[PDB]
């Protein structure tokens, strides 16, 4: 469960609206804002004494999230496990 979310947009900067979809420990968050994204966006997590368990550390996807137009919250979207998605606009 390393892949957590996606960024969609055009310029992908603070000039225009962009769509950010991120899963966290208990929910899924969808936001649309004039985000100022990090040079290399990611989520920070740390691990327990045993490698089997982990906890939320910091959120490092963007430096700012101004002029938001949309927000939605629900439950997480997420042998080996195969997950498939289709994204349309």
């Amino acid at each position: 469960n390393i892949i957590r979310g996606w960024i969609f947009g055009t310029t992908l900067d603070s000039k225009t609206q962009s769509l950010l979809i991120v899963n966290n420990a208990t929910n899924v968050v969808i936001k649309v804002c004039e985000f100022q994204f990090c040079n290399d966006p990611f989520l920070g997590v740390y691990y327990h004494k045993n490698n089997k368990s982990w906890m939320e550390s910091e959120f490092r996807v963007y430096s700012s999230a101004n002029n938001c137009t949309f927000e939605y919250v629900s439950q997480p979207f997420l042998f080996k496990n195969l997950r498939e998605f289709v994204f349309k606009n």
Partner: antibody
Amino acid sequence: EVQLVESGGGVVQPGGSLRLSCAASGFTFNSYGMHWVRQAPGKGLEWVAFIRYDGGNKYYADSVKGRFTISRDNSKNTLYLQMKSLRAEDTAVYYCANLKDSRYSGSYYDYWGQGTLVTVS
Amino acid sequence: VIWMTQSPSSLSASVGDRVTITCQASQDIRFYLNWYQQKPGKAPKLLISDASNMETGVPSRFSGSGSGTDFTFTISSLQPEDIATYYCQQYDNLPFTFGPGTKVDFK
């Protein structure tokens, strides 16, 4: 790493025809749209045509519209330009490129080929 | 068709000098403008996209700005390696167009 190689250039007469091609490698060619841009010696850049990643839609400049056709082959990773009814004014170095474009091409990178010289005389 | 113009057509400057190039669009193209650099015998290289977005690998001495119809390109401290012709491209609407270009020479 990322390569774009134009070929098929040569010397032809007015009223004739010539077909150019551009080989692509090192990247997911079939994921990107492509542009043709030409430049005469000592002159600035002239945009020629654009084709979508799927080879669906095609766009042309008025200077070539009705005479030139843009096409591509995603199985051989090759871009083509079919030129008919050539004129002296078509003398230029023809480039294939993946132009960075936040609105249309969707590319986050910008690549240009070596260019191939076409002469009409 | 959106037409692009540039000013000056050419300029000369010494090492350490500040160099500016002005571009203008016949139509409002928002910030959808690319700045290309070209030297003889070589293909154009992209230095700036979306008006002011600096490309990775481009030296900090380069910058861009402007919006709407009026755009600018600046070199804060000209080097011997910065002698080239710069072009503006608009990509707001197809067909795309390039400007006439501005040449920077060595003083």
